[PDB]
Write the structure tokens for this entry.
Amino acid sequence: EGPLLEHGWIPELPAARDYTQRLTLNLSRLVNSLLEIEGIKHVNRLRLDDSFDKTAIEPVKGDTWSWSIKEGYYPRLWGEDPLNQLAQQNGPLRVIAKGGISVSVSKEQIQASLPSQSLIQNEPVILAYGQHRDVG
Amino acid sequence: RTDRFSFVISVVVNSDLIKLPGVDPYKLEEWVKETILTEFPAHISMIIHWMDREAFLNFANTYQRWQNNGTPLGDAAYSILESLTLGKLPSALKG
């Protein structure tokens, strides 16, 4: 339907918000996307540790989950993600397993279990020839 | 001053299970009494006291000599009575 896409087809759009105004990010929808996975039974916390003040991200009127990033910026939630944040056991993400045992992981171990995407190229569609017959 | 001797089983545990990192011993203890709750009788009551490797091994010798004699009320039992809170009369064997 759309324009010619050499890589993949995009039948559904991500519905990107406009960048004329500042943008709220509502995370109350996140929990069931987080509750989905097999080993996860629930989540215990959802907050930010005072790293929003550099661009004055204000939480909107009453709800704890939403935050509004100021005009130009876009979220980068964990920059240089596993080695900087997730593996180091500083706790940006604290896993609690069997009451309290609270196990952790390194950087390279989760990349093997990470889904690796595939670069796909879309060749043009043609009808190949049949056998030429001497009707002449 | 409470009645302690009626229906109270004491389970002495190693503290090397808590020695593993990331334990949060309170959060582990919510799981430990979670499973063995079904294992105990309803009337039967459990307080636990967990200690280091060396005080466990001093208990581990005194329990077997207690059980090999056939549970006597002698000096082997009074050492176990000292090992808990409840206090014992050890004055006959002072040294």
In short: Chain A touches chain B at residues 96, 98-104 (CB under 8 Å). Helices of chain A lie at 30-35, 81-86, 107-112. The longest helix of chain A spans residues 30-35.
